[PDB]
């Protein structure tokens, strides 16, 4: 009944927390941002399309779609760039936007939500940045780079807004608790 | 050089995230709350005491101590132990905020420098039905979790939002705060 339109092992792991059986499937959606598209609009669209793209292969199902980007001074986002990309993040608040869609392919009902999560980075030195790339995992070693994590749900940062998903599931009469 | 003064397997797992060599040892402390001791005073005291209790065993080291308490309507709340008490705790949590205070201490036994901090984390609950409460307890059996839920797992099904500096703090070790203390002692995990 429940389908995750993703082959991400992180998203898979997160969904397993809800203890509802599901199957994974790759959506094969082009995630390239459009010209005048905001971060919020983009992940919203991508979440929806990923869920809707599987509707014929899984035509009597609740299909979960999700997408995430981060914004580094208003820009949507090799080991070579990480040095710069961490250099860009340094001393700044980097906002992640995570879109979520639950599509009922049986009756066409769609629920969507976009949830922000702010990562406040420490002022980093070049050495730190170098050392870190030599060795981001917000649930792991990336904690060494942060001053503060600010958002509704730490699962969102990892890539699936589970609190929001539970609400959507409750609306579809599939409270994980029942 | 780094020592974790803890009998907790999850504190060990969390500290590993920093990728610094350490050893664990069980601390020697009275964990009993004292009379009129507030939740924040308790976890600060216990964190400092755990770290300091290993100073003679580990006299040239950085020693980490930590303690956590769960607070519901101003009252320290322990492990439920029974299903009845688990349902009771969750009724108290329902539509409410559960606050965890996590004390942290780093004691340098070589130069005697002690750093301590208490960091809160607030778990905002949904308004839960009796059926939801009964189902969670039966599925999860959180009988040895103070507050009667597991935030890192199926407990996410109960929450409206999570409010705090660092998700690790909720799991029982404030890692952002610990990193700061380690840097202050010239032991940056990134160095």
Residue numbers in the entry:
A (entry chain B): 3 to 79, 84 to 141, 151 to 193
B (entry chain A): 3 to 193
Give sentences from the paper.
Screening of Maf proteins for pyrophosphatase activity against a set of 57 noncanonical or modified nucleoside triphosphates revealed that the YhdE-like Maf proteins (E. coli YhdE, BSU28050, YOR111W, and ASMTL-Maf) also exhibited high pyrophosphatase activity against 5-methyl-UTP (m5UTP or riboTTP), pseudouridine triphosphate (pseudo-UTP or Ψ), and 5-methyl-CTP (m5CTP), whereas the two YceF proteins (from E. coli and S. typhimurium) were active toward 7-methyl-GTP (m7GTP). The Michaelis-Menten constant, KM, of the YhdE-like proteins toward canonical pyrimidine nucleotides varied in a micromolar range: 32.7–53.0 μM for dTTP; 29.7–72.4 μM for UTP; and it was lower (to a lesser extent for ASMTL-Maf) with modified nucleotides (4.7–47.2 μM). Both YceF proteins also showed high affinity to m7GTP (32.8 μM for YceF and 30.9 μM for STM1189). Therefore, we propose that the unprotonated Asp88 of ASMTL-Maf (Asp70 in YhdE, Asp103 in YOR111W, Asp70 in BSU28050, and Asp69 in YceF) functions as a general base coordinating a water molecule to produce a nucleophilic hydroxide ion, which attacks the alpha-phosphate of the substrate. This is supported by the complete loss of activity in the ASMTL-Maf D88A (and D88N), YhdE D70A, YOR111W D103A, BSU28050 D70A, and YceF D69A mutant proteins. The structure of the inactive YceF D69A protein showed no changes in the position of the side chains of other residues in the active sites, suggesting that the loss of activity in this protein is caused by the replacement of the catalytic Asp69 by Ala. Alanine replacement mutagenesis of the predicted triphosphate binding residues in ASMTL-Maf (Arg24, Lys65, Lys100), YOR111W (Arg30, Lys74, Lys116), YhdE (Arg13, Lys52, Lys82), BSU28050 (Arg14, Lys53, Lys82), and YceF (Arg13, Lys52, Lys81) produced inactive proteins, confirming that these residues play an important role in activity of Maf proteins and suggesting that they are likely to be involved in the coordination of the triphosphate part of the substrate.
Maf (for multicopy associated filamentation) proteins represent a large family of conserved proteins implicated in cell division arrest but whose biochemical activity remains unknown. Here, we show that the prokaryotic and eukaryotic Maf proteins exhibit nucleotide pyrophosphatase activity against 5-methyl-UTP, pseudo-UTP, 5-methyl-CTP, and 7-methyl-GTP, which represent the most abundant modified bases in all organisms, as well as against canonical nucleotides dTTP, UTP, and CTP. The protomer structures of the four Maf proteins revealed a large β sheet containing seven β strands (β1 to β7) with two α-helical subdomains on one side and one long α helix on another side. Thus, pyrophosphatase activity of Maf proteins toward canonical and modified nucleotides might provide the molecular mechanism for a dual role of these proteins in cell division arrest and house cleaning.
